[PDB]
Coordinates of C-alpha atoms and ligand atoms in Angstrom, one line a residue:
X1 CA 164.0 -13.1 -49.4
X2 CA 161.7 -14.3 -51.3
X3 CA 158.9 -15.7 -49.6
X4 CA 158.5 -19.8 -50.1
X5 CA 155.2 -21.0 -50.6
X6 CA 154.4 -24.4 -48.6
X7 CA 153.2 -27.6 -49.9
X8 CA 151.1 -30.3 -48.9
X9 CA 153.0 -31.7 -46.0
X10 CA 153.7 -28.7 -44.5
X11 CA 150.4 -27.3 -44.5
X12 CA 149.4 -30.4 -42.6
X13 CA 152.3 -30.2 -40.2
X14 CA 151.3 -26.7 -38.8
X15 CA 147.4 -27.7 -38.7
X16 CA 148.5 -30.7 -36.7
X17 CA 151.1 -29.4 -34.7
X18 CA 148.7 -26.3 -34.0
X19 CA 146.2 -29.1 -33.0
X20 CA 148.3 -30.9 -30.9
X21 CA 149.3 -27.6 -28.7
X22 CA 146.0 -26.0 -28.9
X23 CA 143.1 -28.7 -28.9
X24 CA 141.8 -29.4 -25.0
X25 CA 141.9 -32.9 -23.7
X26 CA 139.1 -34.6 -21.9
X27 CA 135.4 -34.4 -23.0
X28 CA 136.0 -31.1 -24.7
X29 CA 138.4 -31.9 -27.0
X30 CA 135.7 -33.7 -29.5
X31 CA 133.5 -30.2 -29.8
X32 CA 136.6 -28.3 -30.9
X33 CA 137.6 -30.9 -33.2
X34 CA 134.3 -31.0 -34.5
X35 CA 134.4 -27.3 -35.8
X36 CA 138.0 -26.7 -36.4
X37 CA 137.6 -30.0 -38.9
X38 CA 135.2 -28.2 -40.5
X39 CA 137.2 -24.8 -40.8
X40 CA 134.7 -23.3 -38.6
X41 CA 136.4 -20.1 -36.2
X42 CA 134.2 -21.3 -33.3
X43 CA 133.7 -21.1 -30.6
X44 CA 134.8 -17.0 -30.2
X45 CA 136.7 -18.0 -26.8
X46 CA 140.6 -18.1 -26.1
X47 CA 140.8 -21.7 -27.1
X48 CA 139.7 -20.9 -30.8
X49 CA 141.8 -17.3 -30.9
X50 CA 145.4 -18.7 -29.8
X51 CA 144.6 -21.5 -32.5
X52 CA 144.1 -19.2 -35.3
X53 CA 147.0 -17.2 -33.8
X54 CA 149.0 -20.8 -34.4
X55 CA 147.5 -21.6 -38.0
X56 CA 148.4 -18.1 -39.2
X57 CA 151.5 -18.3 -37.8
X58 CA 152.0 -21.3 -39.2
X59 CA 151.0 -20.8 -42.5
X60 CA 152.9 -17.2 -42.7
X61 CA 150.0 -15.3 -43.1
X62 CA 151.2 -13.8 -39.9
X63 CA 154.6 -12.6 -39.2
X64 CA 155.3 -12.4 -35.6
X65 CA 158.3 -10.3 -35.6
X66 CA 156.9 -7.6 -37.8
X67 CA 153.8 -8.1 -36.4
X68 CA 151.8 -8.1 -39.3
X69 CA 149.9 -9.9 -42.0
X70 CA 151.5 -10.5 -45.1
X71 CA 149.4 -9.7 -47.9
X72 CA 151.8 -10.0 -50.7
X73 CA 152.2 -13.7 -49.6
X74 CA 148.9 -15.2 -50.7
X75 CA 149.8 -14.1 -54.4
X76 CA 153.1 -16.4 -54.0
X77 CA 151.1 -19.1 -52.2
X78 CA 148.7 -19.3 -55.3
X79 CA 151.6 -19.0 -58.0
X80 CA 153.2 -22.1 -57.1
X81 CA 150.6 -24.6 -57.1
X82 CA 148.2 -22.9 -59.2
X83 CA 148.3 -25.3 -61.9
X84 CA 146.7 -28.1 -59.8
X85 CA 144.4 -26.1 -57.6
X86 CA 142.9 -24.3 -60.8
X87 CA 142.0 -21.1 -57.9
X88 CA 140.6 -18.1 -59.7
X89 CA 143.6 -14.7 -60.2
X90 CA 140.4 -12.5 -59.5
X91 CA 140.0 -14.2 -55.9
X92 CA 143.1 -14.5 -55.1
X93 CA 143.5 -10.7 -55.3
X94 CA 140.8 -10.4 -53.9
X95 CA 141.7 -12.1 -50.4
X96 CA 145.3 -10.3 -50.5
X97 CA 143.4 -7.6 -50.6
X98 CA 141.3 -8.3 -47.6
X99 CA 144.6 -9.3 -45.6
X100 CA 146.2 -5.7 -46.5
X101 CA 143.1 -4.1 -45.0
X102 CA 143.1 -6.1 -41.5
X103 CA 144.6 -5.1 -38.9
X104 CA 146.9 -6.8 -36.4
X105 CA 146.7 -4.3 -33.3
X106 CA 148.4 -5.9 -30.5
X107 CA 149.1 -9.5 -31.9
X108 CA 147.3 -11.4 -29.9
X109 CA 145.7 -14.0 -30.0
X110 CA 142.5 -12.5 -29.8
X111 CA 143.6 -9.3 -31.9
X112 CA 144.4 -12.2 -34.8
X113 CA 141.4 -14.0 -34.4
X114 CA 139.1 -10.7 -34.6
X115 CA 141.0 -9.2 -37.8
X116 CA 140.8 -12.4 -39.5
X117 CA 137.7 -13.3 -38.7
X118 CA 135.7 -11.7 -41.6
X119 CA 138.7 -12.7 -44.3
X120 CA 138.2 -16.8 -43.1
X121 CA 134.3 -16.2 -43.6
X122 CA 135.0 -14.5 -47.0
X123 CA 137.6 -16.7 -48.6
X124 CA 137.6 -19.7 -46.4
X125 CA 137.0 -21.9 -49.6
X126 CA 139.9 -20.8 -51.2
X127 CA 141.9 -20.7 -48.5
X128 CA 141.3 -24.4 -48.2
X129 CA 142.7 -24.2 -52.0
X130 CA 145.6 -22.7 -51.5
X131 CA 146.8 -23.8 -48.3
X132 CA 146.1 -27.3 -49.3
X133 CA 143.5 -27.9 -46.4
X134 CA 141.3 -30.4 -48.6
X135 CA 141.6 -34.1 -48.2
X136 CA 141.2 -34.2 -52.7
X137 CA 143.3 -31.0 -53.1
X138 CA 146.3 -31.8 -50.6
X139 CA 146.4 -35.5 -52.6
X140 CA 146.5 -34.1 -56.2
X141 CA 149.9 -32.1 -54.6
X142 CA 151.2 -35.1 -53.6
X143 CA 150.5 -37.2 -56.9
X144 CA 151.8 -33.8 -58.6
X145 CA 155.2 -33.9 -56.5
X146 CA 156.7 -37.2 -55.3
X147 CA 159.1 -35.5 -53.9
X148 CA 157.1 -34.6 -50.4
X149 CA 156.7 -36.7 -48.2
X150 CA 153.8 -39.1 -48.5
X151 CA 151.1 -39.5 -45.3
X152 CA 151.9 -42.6 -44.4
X153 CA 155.6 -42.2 -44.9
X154 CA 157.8 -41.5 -42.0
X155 CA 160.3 -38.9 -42.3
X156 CA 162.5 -41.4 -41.7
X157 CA 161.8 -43.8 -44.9
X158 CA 161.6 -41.2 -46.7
X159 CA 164.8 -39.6 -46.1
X160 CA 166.9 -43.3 -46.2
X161 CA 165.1 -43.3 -49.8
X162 CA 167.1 -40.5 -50.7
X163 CA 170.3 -41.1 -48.5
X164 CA 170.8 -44.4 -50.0
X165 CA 170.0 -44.0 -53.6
X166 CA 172.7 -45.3 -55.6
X167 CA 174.6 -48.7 -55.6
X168 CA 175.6 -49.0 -52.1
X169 CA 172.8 -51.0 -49.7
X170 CA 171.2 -48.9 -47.3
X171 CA 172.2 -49.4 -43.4
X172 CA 168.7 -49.7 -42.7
X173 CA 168.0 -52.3 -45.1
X174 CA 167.3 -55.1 -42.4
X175 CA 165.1 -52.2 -40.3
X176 CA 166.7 -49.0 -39.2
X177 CA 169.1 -49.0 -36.0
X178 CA 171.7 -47.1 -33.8
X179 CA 175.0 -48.0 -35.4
X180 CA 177.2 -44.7 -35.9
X181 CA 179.0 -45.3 -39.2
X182 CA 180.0 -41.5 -40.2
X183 CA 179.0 -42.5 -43.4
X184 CA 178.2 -39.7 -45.9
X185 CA 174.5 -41.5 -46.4
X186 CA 174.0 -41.8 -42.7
X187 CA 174.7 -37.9 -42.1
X188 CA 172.6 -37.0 -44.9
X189 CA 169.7 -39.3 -43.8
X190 CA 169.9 -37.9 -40.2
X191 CA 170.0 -34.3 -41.8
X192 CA 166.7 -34.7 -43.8
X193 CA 165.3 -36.1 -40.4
X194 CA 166.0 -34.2 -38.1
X195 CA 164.7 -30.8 -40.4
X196 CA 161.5 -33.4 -40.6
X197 CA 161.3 -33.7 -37.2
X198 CA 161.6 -29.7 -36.9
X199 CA 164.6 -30.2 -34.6
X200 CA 166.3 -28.3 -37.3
X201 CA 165.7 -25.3 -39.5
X202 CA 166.7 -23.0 -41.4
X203 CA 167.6 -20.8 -38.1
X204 CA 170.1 -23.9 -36.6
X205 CA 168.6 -25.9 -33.3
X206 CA 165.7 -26.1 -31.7
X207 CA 166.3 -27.5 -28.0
X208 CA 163.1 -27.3 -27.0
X209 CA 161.9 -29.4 -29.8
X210 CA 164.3 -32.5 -28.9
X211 CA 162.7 -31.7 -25.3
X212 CA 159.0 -32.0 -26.4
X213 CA 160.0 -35.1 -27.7
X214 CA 161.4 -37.0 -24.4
X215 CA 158.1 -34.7 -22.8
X216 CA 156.2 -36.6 -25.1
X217 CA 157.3 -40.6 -23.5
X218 CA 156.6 -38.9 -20.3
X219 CA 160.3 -37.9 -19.0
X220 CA 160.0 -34.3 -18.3
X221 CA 162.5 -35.5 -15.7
X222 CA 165.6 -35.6 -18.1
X223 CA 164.7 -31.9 -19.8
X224 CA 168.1 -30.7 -18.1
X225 CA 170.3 -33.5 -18.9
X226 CA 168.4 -33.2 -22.8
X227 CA 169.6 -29.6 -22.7
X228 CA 173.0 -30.8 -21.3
X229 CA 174.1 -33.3 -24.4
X230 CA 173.1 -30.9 -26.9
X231 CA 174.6 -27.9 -25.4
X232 CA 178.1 -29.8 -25.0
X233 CA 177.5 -31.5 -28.0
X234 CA 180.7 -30.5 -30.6
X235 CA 179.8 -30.1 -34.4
X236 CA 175.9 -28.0 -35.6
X237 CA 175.0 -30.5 -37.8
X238 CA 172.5 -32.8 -37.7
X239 CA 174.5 -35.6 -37.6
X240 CA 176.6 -34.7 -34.5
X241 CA 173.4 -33.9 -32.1
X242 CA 172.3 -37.6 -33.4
X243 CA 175.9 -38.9 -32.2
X244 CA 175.8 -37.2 -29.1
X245 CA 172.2 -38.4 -27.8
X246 CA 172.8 -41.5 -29.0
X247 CA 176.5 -41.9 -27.2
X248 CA 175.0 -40.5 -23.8
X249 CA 173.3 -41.3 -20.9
X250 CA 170.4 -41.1 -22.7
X251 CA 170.8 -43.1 -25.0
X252 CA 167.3 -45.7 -25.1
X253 CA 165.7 -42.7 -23.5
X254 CA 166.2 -40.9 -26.7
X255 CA 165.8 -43.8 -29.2
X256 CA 162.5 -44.4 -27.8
X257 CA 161.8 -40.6 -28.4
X258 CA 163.2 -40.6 -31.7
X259 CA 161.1 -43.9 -32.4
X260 CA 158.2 -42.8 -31.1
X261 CA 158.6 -39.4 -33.5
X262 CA 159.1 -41.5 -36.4
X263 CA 155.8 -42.9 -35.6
X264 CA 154.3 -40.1 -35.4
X265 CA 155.7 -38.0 -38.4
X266 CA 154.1 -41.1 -40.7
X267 CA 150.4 -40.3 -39.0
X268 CA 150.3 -36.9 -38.4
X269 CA 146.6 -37.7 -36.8
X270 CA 148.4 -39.8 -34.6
X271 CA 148.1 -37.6 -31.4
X272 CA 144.7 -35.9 -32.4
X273 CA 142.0 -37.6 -30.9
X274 CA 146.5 -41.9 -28.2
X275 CA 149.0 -41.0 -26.2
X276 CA 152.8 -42.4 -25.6
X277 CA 151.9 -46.4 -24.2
X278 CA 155.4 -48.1 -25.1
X279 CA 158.3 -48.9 -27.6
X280 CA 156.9 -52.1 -28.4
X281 CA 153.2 -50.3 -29.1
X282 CA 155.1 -47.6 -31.1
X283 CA 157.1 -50.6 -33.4
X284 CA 153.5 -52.8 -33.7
X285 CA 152.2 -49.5 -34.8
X286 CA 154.6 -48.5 -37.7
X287 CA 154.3 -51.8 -38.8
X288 CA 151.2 -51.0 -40.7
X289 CA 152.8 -48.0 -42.2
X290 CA 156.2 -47.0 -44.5
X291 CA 158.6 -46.3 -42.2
X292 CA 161.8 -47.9 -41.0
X293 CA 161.0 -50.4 -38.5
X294 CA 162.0 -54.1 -38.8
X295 CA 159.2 -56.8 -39.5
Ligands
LIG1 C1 143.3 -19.6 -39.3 C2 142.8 -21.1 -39.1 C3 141.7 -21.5 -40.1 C4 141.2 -22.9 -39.9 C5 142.1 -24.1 -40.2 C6 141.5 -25.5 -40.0 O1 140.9 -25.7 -38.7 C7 142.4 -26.6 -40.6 C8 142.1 -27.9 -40.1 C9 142.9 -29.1 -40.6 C10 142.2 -29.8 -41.8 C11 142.8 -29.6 -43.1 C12 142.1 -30.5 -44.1 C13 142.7 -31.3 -45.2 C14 144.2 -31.3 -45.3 C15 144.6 -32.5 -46.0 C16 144.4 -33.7 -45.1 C17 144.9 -35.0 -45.7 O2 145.8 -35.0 -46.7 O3 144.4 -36.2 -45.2 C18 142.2 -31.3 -41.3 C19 143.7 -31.8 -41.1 O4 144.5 -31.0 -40.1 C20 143.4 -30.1 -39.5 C21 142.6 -31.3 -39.8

């Protein structure tokens, strides 16, 4: 409409996120890690086929609702960031190519995992290049474009950097809070964070990601009451879902949600290998990071 290629940040967003909702947990989690660390397709079981399913999704090289792989993408991917990857035309045509060969059948997990299969063992290298999936590649992005969000940074700090950019003091400047100004900074701020946060795209809401988020400081319990505030929530921006939570019943349920995703969107290792313990945990812990939090 056209396509947009994707930088640094969100590469690592879907390989996290696609970590996050396909690694196991308990003993078997380190043996997937292991391989899938190392861009290895193994091993050839459901575990490994759902989580290529996710990365291609996630990446775009697989549309879901046509069902397909998109060849013409990789070109675009290349294009944009070719000047800093330094990846070869010729290859790039090359695994396009490839792509436009494979075939999709049902869509399945599986289905993905087998068409792609022999296109990962072909091009994985420059895969890795274009889809900045290299630790030295993904920082030469960021040092290209300081516009993206930094590991290290939370959404959060990095969207009150641009919120607040002019004369006026930000009203986070003593550590970020609750107060509901209406300002034109604050809905800006919480506009940027919430499409950080992926509660928010380009298609509107996403309840169900608000709801992984309470899921996430173990209270599944309050999923219908979540749904409940949003639904009867006035206003579709940003701003007025933010209002809402915050001037409900849930009010330190969700700030400890929202917290706890700040957290987590400056380490997005943070769930990888740690679980929810506690707000006071969560504030220690973005201490040693840029975020908002009050030292
Ligand atoms: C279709 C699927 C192909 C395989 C994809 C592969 O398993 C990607 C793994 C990612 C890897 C991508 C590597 C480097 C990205 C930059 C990391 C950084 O800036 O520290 C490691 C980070 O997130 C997981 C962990």
């Amino acid at each position: 409409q056209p396509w947009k290629a994707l930088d640094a940040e969100q590469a690592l967003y879907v390989y996290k996120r696609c970590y996050e909702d396909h690694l196991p947990s308990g003993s078997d989690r380190k043996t997937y890690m292991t391989l899938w660390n190392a861009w290895r397709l193994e091993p050839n079981d459901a575990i490994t086929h759902c989580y290529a399913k996710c990365v291609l999704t996630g990446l775009q090289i697989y549309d879901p609702q046509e069902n397909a792989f998109k060849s013409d993408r990789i070109p675009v991917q290349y294009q944009a960031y070719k000047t800093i990857t330094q990846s070869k035309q010729k290859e790039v045509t090359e695994y396009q190519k490839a792509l436009a060969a494979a075939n999709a059948k049902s869509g399945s997990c599986v289905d993905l995992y087998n068409a792609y299969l022999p296109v990962h063992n072909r091009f994985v290298n420059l895969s890795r290049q274009l889809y900045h999936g290299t630790v030295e590649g993904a920082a030469k992005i960021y040092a290209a474009m300081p516009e993206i969000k930094q590991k290290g940074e939370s959404f959060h700090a990095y969207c009150e950097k641009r919120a607040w950019k002019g004369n006026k003091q930000s009203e986070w400047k003593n550590g970020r809070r609750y107060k509901l100004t209406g300002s034109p900074e604050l809905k800006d701020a919480i506009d940027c964070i919430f499409r950080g946060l992926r509660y928010m795209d380009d298609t509107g809401l996403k309840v169900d990601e608000i709801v992984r988020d309470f899921n996430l400081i173990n209270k599944s319990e309050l999923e219908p009451e979540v749904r409940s505030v949003l639904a009867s929530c006035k206003g579709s921006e940003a701003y007025d879902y933010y209002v809402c939570l915050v001037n409900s019943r849930l009010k330190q349920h969700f700030k400890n949600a929202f917290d706890f995703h700040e957290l987590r969107s400056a380490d997005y290792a943070y769930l990888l290998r740690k679980v929810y313990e506690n707000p006071e945990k969560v504030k220690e812990e973005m201490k040693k990071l840029n975020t908002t939090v009050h030292f």
